[PDB]
Design a protein around this ligand. Structure first.
Ligand code: SF4
Ligand code: F3S
Length: 106
C-alpha cells in the first residue's frame, strides 16, 4: 500500500487521483487517504503529489508511522474521490509546514 502523510493536510492538491488505476483515494475536508486493501502499489501517484506527501508503506518516515493506520481507518469512513479538483485555497502557504496532523478534520 502507498500512504498519504502529513504534508497533504491543508494542501490537498488532488493531482494523485489522476494517475490511480484503481481509484483507491478517499476524500476528507482537508486531506486524502489511500485505501490499503485496494491499492495495487503501482507507485504512480507518488511522483504526482506536489507536496511529496505519498510514501510506500515501507518507506513512511519513523515520525509519520501513525499515518499508515490513519489511512486505513479514514478510508473506511470517507467518500471515494476519482476526479482531480482545485487545491485548497491557501495550499502553498501550508505546503511544507511540519506538524499539520493537529489540523486534520474528520
Ligand atoms: S500506488 Fe497506485 S494504486 Fe496505490 S494509490 Fe497510488 S496510484 Fe493508486
Ligand atoms: S497533497 Fe494530498 S490530495 Fe494528493 S496530490 Fe498530494 S496526496
Amino acid at each position: 500500500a502507498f500512504v498519504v502523510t502529513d504534508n497533504c493536510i491543508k494542501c490537498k492538491y488532488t493531482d494523485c487521483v489522476e494517475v490511480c488505476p484503481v481509484d483507491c483515494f478517499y476524500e476528507g475536508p482537508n486531506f486524502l487517504v489511500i485505501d490499503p486493501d485496494e491499492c495495487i502499489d503501482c507507485a504512480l501517484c507518488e511522483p504526482e503529489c506536489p507536496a511529496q506527501a505519498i510514501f510506500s508503506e515501507d518507506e513512511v518516515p519513523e515520525d509519520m508511522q501513525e499515518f499508515i493506520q490513519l489511512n486505513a481507518e479514514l478510508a473506511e469512513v470517507w467518500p471515494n474521490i476519482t476526479e482531480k479538483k482545485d487545491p485548497l485555497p491557501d495550499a502553498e502557504d501550508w505546503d511544507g509546514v511540519k506538524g499539520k496532523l493537529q489540523h486534520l478534520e474528520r
